């Protein structure tokens, strides 16, 4: 997560392959909706937040 | 001092995985900072360090250590802060600790990252030369 | 002559200079650069005249390709490890690009903008007299986009002189900052729980303001409306529901609420650095009585 | 009267305080034409007026050469010099609450929008959206109360009034106002050389169009 | 015996090179060598700049001439380029700043001739060195 | 978990919510004065309040629990 925010979307299933510049995620946060793009093709494992919650800078949204 | 045993050979024969560590440290660009403690801490016994004024002027580090069992008191520019500017504050920090080693026979080493002092009318106004003298 | 191509914009990047300052009387707020004193740095980095524009990066992950010719950048607030090709250069230093060369901005260590300065500036078309760009009422060059083609203005004839500045790390976490008081500090029943109170940043912070939370701050009088009034970067609202709120640099040109304190231009820029999620402790720059 | 409360609004800007519109836009002219040096901007409003400096070496100075001047007495004025309307705008009054909040004070909406069309207003301060102004010194009967509630979504063009203020809003925005009618002026437009089309010390004037 | 350095300035000569900086090590050794043994005067009568300020510093007594001398380690365009601040060599380093503000001045003299007179003044009360008494 | 937990040794100086009372993350929950300064608790998740097991004027622990949700 480039910043901390509120995870207003999860876009992806667990698991779920994806491919490079799809969306992972959307945060609330600079009051402004900031899209998580993926940044390689793979394989969407253990996405490890849930929609409206709140998340801190850095955290991992998903390894790839 | 405490007891260590010192290894057999060169310089160049006993070089450590830890020492070839250090070969990779400095980063290619000149202006890219890097945490002066990995040198401090890879040149000390057990990389073990007494910080001394940890949180005052951190653009200079100084603190004891061991070498080979020998107490040391080092003294180090900290790139992270001020790109490691000498100002008022590191001079006089820097300056005491030297002063108290020297008291009390510790040897002193220096790691030198240093690109001026910090400029600016501030230093100026508050006596850069004649603080920064104490170091000398 | 030479552009640059936007490859990534990270979450945002911006168009910024001095702003366009005494437009008061068309309702048109200064904007321009959060942080001036890094705008302003980089710009005496690359030697353009404070006046050229830079790109204000926020959250770093800026990307951008040199085209057309050779240039002298510099990068200067929130640390990001600027790089070219991927080999790192020195925030707050000069580094000159060759064509073809790509320029990269990582995650910041600490701060929030980054200013990117290049030799002769952003030439964009200015609006109103200034390329900033005011997030509120969208008056300047539109916030960039992937494939955003920047030109590079003609340079003056002085030269870099100065390979790097050095500048005081910025704060992690506790922003300590100095407020002058009032002038409506009399609204509240207590107005130096301002200054005892670590107050909390909240997601809400943008350009327009940082919303803070903490000890709520009790109106004398809270049903009292106030005619609105001017307003400037860094004065602290208090609006009814008893939350400051500290205006950024694309603030409204009046306000509706009391201001409790303003921020010192001595601290004001270090404003333009807090992130969400980080404590802010103020104290009065001078004695508040009545 | 010679000057008002003076506060210091940071280091960076000095405050004056005022009891009524006419000493703000009289004393806003007055330091335009004192042209302190250092000033880099001035900000009338509701009841004040803000002076903003090139920095905080020049507020001591300022403040003191506040003390100096004084205003033409001839220029505190509630109509216009000339009786002149400077602009005037053409409205449709299709307003969502004319009759039931307003009309109620008394006037019927015929009679509402013929005073509002028949009183010269003054282009007061500036503030809230650019190009947006707030017109003051029209018909005292037509100073309904703010309405205690925000609103939102406010048409681009719309034309409103509350307490003692009227004007137009420039573009689609969370107003606050009741609102009378609106118009297709053009109320800001960076690209044209004036942008704004209303700026503080003008005069205007709707006409009615229905 | 004493020492008078009549200081005078503009620092390292650029193209000797790092010559220079091991001569004011040298310099600064011998000054701090000297110190509490023999009465070191300075007398700063030009732009002294970079180097040339820490032996001053080191010295006992700095007498500085009011309009036409100035100290500082780093010069008014470095300080513009990283800090803003415009600021000319007089303010930034003038006699009258280094006694009201820094500390670092003596004696502020209204013409060389002054300063002499001062200086002369000065070597009346002190001995030659530590080892013998006062006048 | 769902609890709000106290991060410092303080006194309640200010109880902002109620039980029932939906909150968003990020909202203010408590004030707790230490060491002379006044510090906020805040919820850290979406919900509405419910455990609600401290009020104005106790001095609490470290790590004590708020509330819940
Ligand atoms: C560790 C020490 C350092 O790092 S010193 C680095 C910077 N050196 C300086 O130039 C000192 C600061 N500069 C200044 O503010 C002024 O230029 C100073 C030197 C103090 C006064 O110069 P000013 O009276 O204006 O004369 P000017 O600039 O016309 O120069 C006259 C001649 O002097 C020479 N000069 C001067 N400084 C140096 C120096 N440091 N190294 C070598 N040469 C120097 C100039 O080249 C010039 O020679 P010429 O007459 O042009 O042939
Ligand atoms: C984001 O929440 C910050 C808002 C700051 C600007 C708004 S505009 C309308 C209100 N009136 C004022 O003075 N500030 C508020």
Known sequence: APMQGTVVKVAVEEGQEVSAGDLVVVLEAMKMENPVTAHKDGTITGLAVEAGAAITQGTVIAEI | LYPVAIPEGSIEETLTDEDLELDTLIPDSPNQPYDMHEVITRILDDDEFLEVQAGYAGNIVVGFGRVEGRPVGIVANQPTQFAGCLDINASEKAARFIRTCDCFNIPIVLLVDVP????????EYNGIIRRGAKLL | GTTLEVLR??????????????????????????????????????????????????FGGFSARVCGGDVAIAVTGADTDPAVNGIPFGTNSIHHVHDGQVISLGAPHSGLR???AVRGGIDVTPVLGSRSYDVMSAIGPSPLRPGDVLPVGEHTDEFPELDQAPVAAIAEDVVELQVVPGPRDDWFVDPDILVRTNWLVTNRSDRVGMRLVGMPLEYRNPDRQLPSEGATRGAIQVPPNGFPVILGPDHPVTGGYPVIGVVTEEDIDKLGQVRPGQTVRLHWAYPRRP | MTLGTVHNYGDQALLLEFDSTAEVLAWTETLREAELLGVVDIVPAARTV???????????????????????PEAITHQP?????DVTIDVVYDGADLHEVASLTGMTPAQVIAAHTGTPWRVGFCGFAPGF????????????????????????????????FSGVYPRQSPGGWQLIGHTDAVMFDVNRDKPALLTPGMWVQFRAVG | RPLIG???????????????????????????????????????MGAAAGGHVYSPALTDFVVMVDQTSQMFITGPDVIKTVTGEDVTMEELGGAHTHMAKSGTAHYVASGEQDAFDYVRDLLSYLPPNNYADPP
Do not use: C, W
Not at chain 4, 81 to 85: S, T
Not at chain 5, 26 to 33: A, D, V
């Open chain 2, 116 to 123: 001026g002092f910090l400029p600016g009318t501030d230093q």
């Open chain 3, 9 to 58: 914009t990270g979450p945002l990047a911006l168009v910024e200079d001095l702003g366009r300052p005494g437009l008061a009387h068309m309702g048109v707020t200064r904007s321009g650069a959060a942080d001036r004193r890094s705008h302003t740095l980089a710009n005496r980095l690359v030697a353009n005249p404070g006046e050229s524009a830079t790109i204000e990066v926020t």
């Open chain 3, 114 to 116: 980054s200013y990117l």
């Open chain 4, 50 to 72: 803000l002076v903003k400096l090139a920095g905080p070496r020049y507020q001591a100075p300022t403040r003191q050469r506040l003390g100096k001047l004084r205003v033409r």
């Open chain 4, 81 to 85: 010099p000339g009786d002149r309307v």
């Open chain 4, 133 to 164: 102004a707030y017109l003051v010194d029209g018909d005292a009967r037509l100073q309904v109360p703010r309405r205690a509630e925000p609103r939102t979504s406010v048409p681009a063009g719309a034309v409103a009034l509350a307490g003692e």
């Open chain 5, 6 to 44: 009549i200081n005078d300035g503009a620092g390292a000569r650029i193209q000797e090179g790092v010559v220079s900086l091991g001569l004011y090590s040298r310099i600064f050794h011998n000054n701090i060598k000297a110190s509490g043994v023999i009465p070191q005067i300075s007398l700063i």
